[PDB]
Amino acid sequence: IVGGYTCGANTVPYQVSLNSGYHFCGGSLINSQWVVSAAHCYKSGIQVRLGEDNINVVEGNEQFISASKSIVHPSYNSNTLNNDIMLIKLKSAASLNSRVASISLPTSCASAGTQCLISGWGNTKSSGTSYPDVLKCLKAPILSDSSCKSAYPGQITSNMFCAGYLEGGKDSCQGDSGGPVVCSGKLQGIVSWGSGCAQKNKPGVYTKVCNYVSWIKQTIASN
């Protein structure tokens, strides 16, 4: 997260870190046994780390649980990042409490102008590299479909929305991928892609979660 703020420990209780020896992507806990992340975060050997603030210090609220199964969206295209969503089932159920909690799925899509909270352990510089140990946050609005398409000609599908600031300076970044965009208490987006980070006229691009709720629910019901 570029241009954000320190969230505060365990204030984003649905935020997870995906670990394969190291933090490599975010995710969102959607019930005691399932995480939503970005398909471009897929790899084998995932440990899901819940209840994290400092990802380099054991602070006392962590739950570390191996993935038992990963399910990349059937229609994920890694070239276009269309359908950039995956589900991860945990080998055991998380213990849910105030610091480790699921985030509600949307019943309806969000609209341009709604403010949302984007979070993660990704890069904090736009012309630099610095990776934080503690969770970072950014409040940002959803942008219009037309401004999104104008920023990224020929690239925005019906499964993508933009959020952030066209002026630059405030965005998600490398290492935030797979993490949440939460708007009025609902998971509306997944950190997906963008040209650089926090560049002028290059807002963040997010997977549009509301398009996937039917797939999420049926997948959970049969797995």
Annotated binding site for Ca(2+): 52, 54, 57, 62
Specify the amino acid at residue 5.
Answer: Y
- Closest approach of Ca ion to the CB of residue 11, in Å: 14
For the CA atoms of the chain, what is the radius of gyration? 16
Q: Which is nearer to Ca ion, 54 or 144 (CB)?
A: 54
Strand 186-193: give its sheet, edge to edge.
5-6, 136-141, 115-120, 180-183, 186-193, 204-208, 160-163
Using DSSP's 3-state secondary structure scheme, residue 215 falls into helix
What number of chain residues touch Ca ion (CB under 5 A)?
3
Residues forming the annotated binding site? 52, 54, 57, 62, 171-172, 174-175, 177
Q: How many whole angstroms separate alpha carbon 59 and alpha carbon 115?
A: 31
The interface with Ca ion within residues 45-104 (CB under 5 A) comprises: 52, 54, 59
Q: Which is nearer to Ca ion, 51 or 168 (CB)?
A: 51
Q: How many whole angstroms separate alpha carbon 50 and alpha carbon 36?
A: 13
Among 28, 40, 73, 102, the one annotated catalytic:
40
130 among known catalytic residues: no
Beta bridge mates, 17: 26, 49
Q: Which is nearer to Ca ion, 54 or 147 (CB)?
A: 54
Q: Tell me the residue ranges of DSSP E strands in the chain.
A: 5-6, 15-19, 23-31, 34-37, 47-50, 63-72, 86-90, 115-120, 136-141, 160-163, 180-183, 186-193, 204-208
- Closest approach of Ca ion to the CB of residue 138, in Å: 21
- Closest approach of Ca ion to the CB of residue 135, in Å: 10
Among 28, 102, 119, 177, the one annotated catalytic:
177
- Closest approach of Ca ion to the CB of residue 55, in Å: 6
Residues forming the annotated binding site for substrate? 171-172, 174-175, 177
Cβ(16)–Cβ(52) below 8 Å: yes
84 among known catalytic residues: yes
Helices (H), the chain: 145-151, 213-221
Q: Which is nearer to Ca ion, 16 or 103 (CB)?
A: 16
40 among known catalytic residues: yes
Cβ(1)–Cβ(176) below 8 Å: yes
> In Å, how far from its chain's centre is CA 76?
16
Q: Which is nearer to Ca ion, 62 or 145 (CB)?
A: 62
- Closest approach of Ca ion to the CB of residue 62, in Å: 5
> What mask of x and - would describe binding to Ca ion in positions 5 to 44, judged by CB under 5 A?
----------------------------------------
**Which residues are designated catalytic?**
40, 84, 177
Binding residues vs Ca ion (CB under 5 A): 52, 54, 59
